[PDB]
């Protein structure tokens, strides 16, 4: 168990995405740092091919648990920490209802000293004029909370979740999250009990930056283990 090591001080983090949603083709930039000793991660993301082709908060959930805190006695079953410094994939399925399909696949580790996520993202089935594809969702975001599963068969971990973005007219837009996540290397990983992550986000804009962006600052904290 090294991994956790690299985690006891602020770390610098890389985040890249490349996606095609229903043709449209954009990239995505984002730089930061994380914290885990507070569950702290601060993030800002630039459109680098332009505007953005769907709404920035649908992408926050694909835009690094490893930087969440795990309490003293769940350390054990920290799972992101010990697949580092080789890293995990992580992919997902995302399901927005009445609507398209993201899925994304990710690379999480680190490049030098750098914590990188490195993303791709295809989206497919969306209607052209529907909330995502029409922009008709509010800038903001929720707490939430994400239970995480041992998947023993492939010596990694699951989740599925809800998240719930507000759309312009009062509705709610779901997005159903499945999640499998696998080492990259060979050595040793920690496989863990039932327990949960509670994530909370929050988006903000940078008044002097004229470029498509967004700025997101996430706490973590992982909980529901007894002693």
């Given at each position: 168990?090294?991994?956790?090591?690299?985690?006891?001080?602020?770390?610098?983090?890389?985040?890249?995405?490349?996606g095609?949603?229903?043709?449209?083709?954009?990239?995505?930039?984002?730089?930061?740092?994380?914290?885990?000793?507070?569950?702290k991660?601060?993030?800002?993301?630039?459109?680098?091919?332009?505007?953005?082709?769907?709404?920035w908060?649908?992408?926050?959930?694909?835009?690094?648990?490893?930087?969440?805190?795990?309490?003293?006695?769940?350390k054990?079953?920290?799972?992101?920490?010990?697949?580092?410094?080789?890293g995990?994939?992580?992919?997902?399925?995302?399901?927005?209802k009445?609507?398209?399909?993201?899925?994304?696949?990710?690379?999480?580790k680190?490049?030098?000293?750098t914590?990188?996520?490195?993303?791709?993202?295809?989206?497919?089935?969306?209607?052209?004029?529907?909330?995502?594809l029409?922009?008709?969702?509010?800038?903001?975001?929720?707490?939430?909370?994400?239970?995480?599963?041992?998947?023993?068969?492939?010596?990694?971990?699951?989740?599925?979740?809800?998240?719930?973005?507000?759309?312009?007219?009062?509705?709610?837009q779901?997005?159903?999250?499945?999640?499998?996540?696998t080492?990259?290397?060979?050595?040793?990983?920690?496989?863990?009990?039932?327990?949960?992550?509670?994530?909370?986000?929050?988006?903000?804009?940078?008044?002097?930056?004229?470029?498509?962006?967004?700025?997101?600052?996430?706490?973590?904290?992982?909980?529901?283990?007894?002693?």
């Open positions: 168990s090294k991994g956790e090591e690299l985690f006891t001080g602020v770390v610098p983090i890389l985040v890249e995405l490349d095609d949603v229903n043709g449209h083709k954009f990239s995505v930039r984002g730089e930061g740092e994380g914290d885990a000793t507070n569950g991660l601060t993030l800002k993301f630039i459109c680098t091919t332009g505007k953005l082709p769907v709404p908060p649908t992408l926050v959930t694909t835009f690094v648990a490893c930087f969440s805190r795990y309490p003293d006695h769940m054990q079953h920290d799972f992101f920490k010990s697949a580092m410094p080789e995990y994939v992580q992919e997902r399925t995302i399901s927005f009445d609507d398209g399909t993201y899925k994304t696949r990710a690379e999480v680190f490049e030098g000293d914590l990188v996520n490195r993303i791709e993202l295809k989206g497919i089935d969306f209607k052209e004029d529907g909330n995502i029409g922009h008709k969702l509010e800038y903001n975001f929720n707490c939430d909370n994400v239970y995480i599963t041992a998947d023993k068969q492939k010596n990694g971990i699951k989740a599925n979740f809800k998240i719930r973005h507000n759309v312009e007219d009062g509705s709610v779901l997005a159903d999250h499945y999640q499998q996540n080492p990259i290397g060979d050595g040793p990983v920690l496989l863990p009990d039932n327990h949960y992550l509670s994530v909370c986000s929050a988006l903000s804009k940078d008044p002097n930056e004229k470029r498509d962006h967004m700025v997101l600052l996430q706490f973590v904290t992982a909980a529901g283990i007894t002693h």
